Amino acid sequence: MDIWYGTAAVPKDLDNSAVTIGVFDGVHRGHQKLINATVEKAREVGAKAIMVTFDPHPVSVFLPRRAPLGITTLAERFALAESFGIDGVLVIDFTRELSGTSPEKYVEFLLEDTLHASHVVVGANFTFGENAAGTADSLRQICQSRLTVDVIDLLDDEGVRISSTTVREFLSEGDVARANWALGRHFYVTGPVVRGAGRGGKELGFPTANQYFHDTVALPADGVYAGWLTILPTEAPVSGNMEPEVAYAAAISVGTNPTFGDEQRSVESFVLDRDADLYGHDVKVEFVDHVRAMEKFDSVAQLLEVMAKDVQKTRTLLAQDVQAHKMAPETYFLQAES
Amino acid sequence: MDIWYGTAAVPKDLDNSAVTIGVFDGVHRGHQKLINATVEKAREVGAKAIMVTFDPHPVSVFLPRRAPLGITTLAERFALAESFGIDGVLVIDFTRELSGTSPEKYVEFLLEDTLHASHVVVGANFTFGENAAGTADSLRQICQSRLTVDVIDLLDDEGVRISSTTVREFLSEGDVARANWALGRHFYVTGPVVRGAGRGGKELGFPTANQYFHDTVALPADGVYAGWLTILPTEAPVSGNMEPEVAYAAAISVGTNPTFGDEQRSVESFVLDRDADLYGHDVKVEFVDHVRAMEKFDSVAQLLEVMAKDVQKTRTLLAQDVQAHKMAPETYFLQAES
Amino acid sequence: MDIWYGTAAVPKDLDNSAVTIGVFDGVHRGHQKLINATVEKAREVGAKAIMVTFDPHPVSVFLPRRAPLGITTLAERFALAESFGIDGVLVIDFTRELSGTSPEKYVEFLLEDTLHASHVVVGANFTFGENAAGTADSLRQICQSRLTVDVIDLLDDEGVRISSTTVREFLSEGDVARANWALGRHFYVTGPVVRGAGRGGKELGFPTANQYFHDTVALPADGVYAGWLTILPTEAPVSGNMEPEVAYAAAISVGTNPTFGDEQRSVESFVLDRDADLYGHDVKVEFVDHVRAMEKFDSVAQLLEVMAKDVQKTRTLLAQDVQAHKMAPETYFLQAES
Amino acid sequence: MDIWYGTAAVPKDLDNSAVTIGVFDGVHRGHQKLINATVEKAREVGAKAIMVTFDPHPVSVFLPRRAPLGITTLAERFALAESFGIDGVLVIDFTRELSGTSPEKYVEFLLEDTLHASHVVVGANFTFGENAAGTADSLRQICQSRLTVDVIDLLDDEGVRISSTTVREFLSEGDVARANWALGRHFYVTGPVVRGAGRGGKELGFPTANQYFHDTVALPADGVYAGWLTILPTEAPVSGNMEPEVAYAAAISVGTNPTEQRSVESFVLDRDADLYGHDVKVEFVDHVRAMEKFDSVAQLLEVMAKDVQKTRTLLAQDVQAHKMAPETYFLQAES
Amino acid sequence: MDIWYGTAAVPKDLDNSAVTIGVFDGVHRGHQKLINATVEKAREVGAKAIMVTFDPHPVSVFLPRRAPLGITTLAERFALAESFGIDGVLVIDFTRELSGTSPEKYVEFLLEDTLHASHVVVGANFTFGENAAGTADSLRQICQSRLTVDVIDLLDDEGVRISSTTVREFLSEGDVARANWALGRHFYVTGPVVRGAGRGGKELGFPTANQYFHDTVALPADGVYAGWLTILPTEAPVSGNMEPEVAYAAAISVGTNPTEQRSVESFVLDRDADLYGHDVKVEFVDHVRAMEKFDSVAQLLEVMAKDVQKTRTLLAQDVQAHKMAPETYFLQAES
Amino acid sequence: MDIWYGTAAVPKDLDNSAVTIGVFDGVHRGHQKLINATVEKAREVGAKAIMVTFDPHPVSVFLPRRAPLGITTLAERFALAESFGIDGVLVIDFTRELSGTSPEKYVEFLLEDTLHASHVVVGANFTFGENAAGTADSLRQICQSRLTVDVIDLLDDEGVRISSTTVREFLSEGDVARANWALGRHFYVTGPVVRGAGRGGKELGFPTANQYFHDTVALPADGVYAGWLTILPTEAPVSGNMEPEVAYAAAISVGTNPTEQRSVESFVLDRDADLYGHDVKVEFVDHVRAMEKFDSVAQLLEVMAKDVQKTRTLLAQDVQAHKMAPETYFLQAES
């Protein structure tokens, strides 16, 4: 997949394409409908499937620092776009172009001159041009005879509208199961493992891995979750008895640094039945189900007792998760008991 | 009007005066009674009308950093004192003088030796001297035959006591209309316009003006308000189609910087039906009515839609405000529609 | 009393001892049972009474920065241990030793090899060894014939379990009287007196003393308390009319610095009927009873009026406190009236 | 004078203009040559005189937070442009447009479509377009018979090159006299007066005005300077014996207070006043001395009085040399 | 000794006193001349000896946060005054009173109404009143037959001027020997001992005590010094083999840790102890070496052992020179 | 290769090993002598080759936050060990164990009980035990007939001593050529690429990759360097015309941005790409120039183009000298 920053970076010799346009944060099941329809139509005519997306978030342009939390990073948005068959992502920055343009010159400059589009796919909510004047209906009538438009209704399922907004609310509530249901996969983050308390190994109270994330990253509510930790492909040695590219059962503790300026979430992972320390590695943490709310501890004995209960509840939730195999990982490690 | 810092700066040759004494924060309608009575009595005898006020706030002397929010700056207190006919303001600092003095030596040093007073005007709540022992009744009996005292009852109107305390509560609640009612004018702030998001002009989502204020400044609750923006007299050029000294209709957005140490309010102004950028100018923002509470936005389209509703509601409230002309500005700009 | 940091610092020639083991934070009435039983048994056999305690808090080892607030500092834990007849305190750091050790090697290394114990005293809640596997019952059966064990039940009185946890809740609620009841003494802090607002002396509104404490220090809820201030023994001169080593009646104001990073409690003390300034001295503040919640003030007169009410209520509570003489200080100053 | 942010804000009905293009930081005597030639050629064809300038600084686009210090604020750049008779300022942001454009397309879009220029005036060092390929020469050959091009050499006077760079050097070493000579006027800063030490009054040691500035503002090296302070037009009352719109003799002390801010403290000669809350203009004339530490009040006041004598002399010279002094001023021969 | 904050706190029934006036920072040998003359003249007329001093520092009123570093804390200034027999300290704040006053009114209010002085003792450099017009001479002519004035010249010894200024220079270069000679005693700081590296015990590399100080405290230049550490009177238990009120031989390492704080780390010779929580007095005797970086543990311990040898020698000299050594001390000839 | 944190994590069933002990920061040519002798002697007795190393740095235990800068991260120390054939790394924390131990007990516990060593290899400067009493010699006499000891002298080559210390000096002055010669390879850092100025693309002035590093990471002095950039193995898409696992020619600009962080900005020659989100390895070859300030875009691009020419030359030399160049690379003769 190609990645282009700005209209100017798109090759001039690109001759035909089918195009979809949106923020696409999270690439939820609704987003997958637009991508699916785009890819299928591009196959039909032997053209390329292009996603046009936006960075920084269009909201943060008008209201700096008050933009919605990112369900995925830009890098992950690229990876997901690839995994669903996109051939090229064009990234638009509204502080550089396409903001003050009229609806008419938007279609002309972007879809024709730049992308040589024959088909375009948008959601019913889609807007464009100066002061958001251009709508889905605008696009249909501006494109009559020039190129075909397909407008897809927003996805409703089980009485819930599937959008970036609702995925954020589920995450914020700590309801990762409903978020996963809306995403069509386990919600996850990735990042380098740093030093934390003690060292991963024989002692249950020390995390197997410690990660930190900036405050523009959407994460579930503080608390403990069941999920899967995966060491990303690597040739570097691993301390202890975990192997790379295997999804390990884990109790995951999401927290907020006290106090800190720009707080600032932590993720501490207790991998079941393994003695390991993952400093240096890039690690993926997938969330499956909520286990408990955060609490304060007044003794080591009390802390470990609750730790053991988390493990027990995690074993149960993960043994269920494996049975719904469309979300569960290919290669996993889960022991029947301790 | 003269301004003196400390008793020592008052001219020795000042021969007669009528004097009023208080913090006077906000110069509300109650404060106006004391000033009115003072000015009128000074006219009668051809003497000067003097306000004795306090800076820093007397409370912050005993409880540093825990002083009440300033309804007006000291500079604005001066301007308001002038506008009501005060001839001289004497500013007292309680860390320099008049704190540990007895009630008797207070009258002697300040009213006689310093100010050569023949008349003094205070509110029923007035206290003075060491450990606040001297009261309004004290002042009457210490001044028998030496000079005339006039003690004015605190102002009650429509079942509400008018004081600095109540004005602060109204502001804190976001009830600017009741605050205005108590002040006898539109509440306002003034300050330099700085750069913010994008540039003021053709795009509705970019503010016409951005200002910041320190946390000792009383401001209405976070939210959106109707009011009037006025560019203060200036010879410097103005970007766009606003003229100086004209009060322009505006939707005003009061906010709190996230997160910041010493937060730290913002004021963003969207001037109706004008394309302009006010970087560099000193700007006055008057508040008229509350419009809505603060909210988070998840798309540009959703943001602009609410923006347009704010404008609609503002046009209505301001068209009413103009009809109560005792508060409304002399020269204003308000279009009947967009 | 000796103080040893680590097993290595304990003298090799120590031949016999009776030993008690715990965090001992606060040395509450429950803790006093263990110490009493230990001291009495050591007297019987002419051996030394040893406390084995822990620093840093064992919880902060597994959960850095999320450890319980310290009811007493380590230094005060030493002083209290001395006052109840302990001959030696051994301080253990779990990042250096005794964490990953098995229950068996724990007893062997610490109690025998290091301390040459013939008697050991623990609470029913006591745990030890890797992953907290060793319990009170473990200790009894591992020590059969090698040394005598005495396990003391946790202290319940008036329907309340007396523990560090409950003492912290009482303090956090502002219920110092119930905390005192559980500690078996007035709760107190000690520290150097620094400069604050104005100077201690003739003016009631200026504190007689200002202290600051870090955020790992347990303190009562923000508000005003009755208690006793004592200048610790010193040869340095004292400004005003307080003498060292005399417990003076005082209204105590506990607060939280606005805003600050790592906030960060203040203690401001208004000593009844004395004019003094205590800059430079080390001062002990004992708490007796809650008086009122924190409030904001809008004038000097209003502030002083409430100040005087605090004094009145304090005089009453302290006159009662003196009557329960098992908590009250030996030498005190309390005037019948102002 | 109009002020347009971006090509999109320029009036569509602009039929003819004479244009000058540059950063114009400081509006020095070199810059004044470009504007003068532009303003005069604009009168000839009855057209408007336009300045195309840039904000943020072009360097800061490539090297964030490592841009040259601003000799004047953008606000002051506008006011100086107006004072030399410019009719419109167009402000280009390089993160928005005209950056990755070709040399050929830059000319067409800016000078032709947007500005409808018949004449353009640039400095010999001018460059434009993608990777700065377009030079002083590129402009001549690309414009042909469409618009007349005038390329002015950089200014050398008394064997000294006059540019934004040399001005910044002069300020940085504390040679305000040379900066001023290069600028064509007294270097100045403008800002609101805040609270400081004590109160302005009878006491010599307390400043008449305190001001703080961000680290992006070029200021003379830390030290003491002779200058003029002016209270900007206002109806707000003034504490003490000073009126607005009169330039008053002052000893000016520039300092630093890190963790950024530079401070400017003004001791107005033979006046007792406190200027808290006013907008105040401070002009620099000559260097007086370096920064120093004081260990007693007496020592500090002794040095303060010398600063006053030296200022008195240097300002009397400034008034006689005439060509740079303020129209309305207040200065005493002695105390 | 009494301590009064402001003229208003002075007893109304004070009928007669002998007075000395000054900053008195450091209470050096020059200052001791003023106090000695004051204390003796007070005994003669059966009166109390009063020190009038100033806090905050007079310079900091005019130049906030740019005041000279304090040689001693105000607390230590009180204790030194008392030790030389002063009966009362009056502390004047210049933001409160006596600042904008005339020379004539200053004398009347302070010396007459408040203190009822019959005799006053000042240094030849003394000044007072509005804009420091009142000098050593002003005081003589204004007091006439009301109170006797004694003006003492500043102290020169061995061709060196002894003042707060010169003491601050000596400390700043790390010449504590000269500072001490000027002071009349070992320079010292006092503070609570906090946690640091490891625990004080058998290990040579871990300090016996760690202390931090604010940036307003004058300290010797970063480096290693020979000195004495004393645990201040206490009933609190001491971890290890040290008693209170005995001055122990120590190698002292002064360092900086910015973003302000200066640190003092004490390595007590031939002792294993940890002084966390105690109040501790640290006296400086001689400079040993400059600060340096270490790249291995072995290297650091090798230098540490040399610091110990050099301290041992220098302290044995201090004990024999007698006139400045502590009454009760602990020092070993060898390890 | 296994990695054990503390003696307690070492397998109980380890019957025989050959052991080397040291900080090993940088794994330079001196260190490679120890490992080589260890790995070979381990093959002889069919045993595993073990490295005992230390984290945190031993100096930082005694002197917190004043430890030497790390030549490599601990992660990179592991990977280099593995590359030279070590079978196990044992990591000792001195705050946990082996610190206050006697020389005699250190040997027994670590080498005997834990590691069951038949052979040990140390550097001539090696020390151990309480207060570093145990030396290179102590080890010989304490081990006797239990385990064979081999003590290797420190490396001198071309009259230059090769140690962690000298490497840190070379880097700090910006002489990466000498650092590399001492290291046996190109010095490198590895990290995630974050957003910076503009976007990597057609524009020369925008970096292909931006990276930040903590102040504990040794880096060459601020300036411009010739080097190679490699995108580490990944399936994640790459924006622009670069593939992973190819070392690309780059001009590398090292800078500082205080209040700590050092920055590394890479300008990849003859490529248009943006590497945001990838893991990227940056190798340093030669110094090109010192840091400088720019006052115009044209000036900056002029210097940028010179940096490219000088890099082109220096890298062509690196490729021919062969012994240190990457296996797979991309470099153009001209533009």
Numbering used by the authors:
A (entry chain A), B (entry chain A), C (entry chain A): 1 to 338
D (entry chain B), E (entry chain B), F (entry chain B): 1 to 259, 263 to 338
Reproduce the article's own wording on this structure.
The overall structures of F206W, D298E and E301A CaFADSs are quite similar to that of the WT (A chains r.m.s.d. values 0.149, 0.152 and 0.251 Å, superimposing 274, 309 and 317 atoms, respectively). The E301A structure shows all residues in chain A but lacks 260, 261 and 262 in chain B. All mutant structures contain, in addition, one sulfate ion and one pyrophosphate molecule, as ligands in each chain. Finally, no conformational changes were observed in L6c or in the α1c helix, which contains the E301A mutation, when comparing this mutant’s structure to that of the WT. However, the H-bond between E301 of one protomer and T127 on loop L8n of the neighboring protomer, which is predicted for the WT dimer of trimers, is not expected in this case. E301 and L304 are predicted to interact with T127 and A132, respectively, of L8n of the neighboring protomer FMNAT site. The lack of interactions between the side chain of residue 301 and T127 in the E301A mutant and the substitution of L304 by Ala would both affect the van der Waals contacts with L8n in the dimer of trimers, producing local effects at this loop that helps close the FMNAT substrate binding site. These mutations can also alter the positive end of the helix α1c dipole, which contributes to the stability of substrate phosphate groups and is located near the FMNAT substrate binding site.
The FAD synthetase from Corynebacterium ammoniagenes (CaFADS) is a bifunctional enzyme responsible for the synthesis of flavin mononucleotide (FMN) and flavin adenine dinucleotide (FAD) cofactors. The C-terminal module catalyzes FMN synthesis from riboflavin (RF) (riboflavin kinase, RFK), while the N-terminal one transforms FMN into FAD (FMN:adenylyltransferase, FMNAT). Bioinformatic tools for the exploration of macromolecular interfaces predict that CaFADS might stabilize in hexameric assemblies in solution, organized as dimer of trimers. In the predicted CaFADS dimer of trimers model, the protomers adopt a head-to-tail organization within each trimer that causes the RFK and FMNAT catalytic sites of two neighboring protomers 6 to be in proximity.
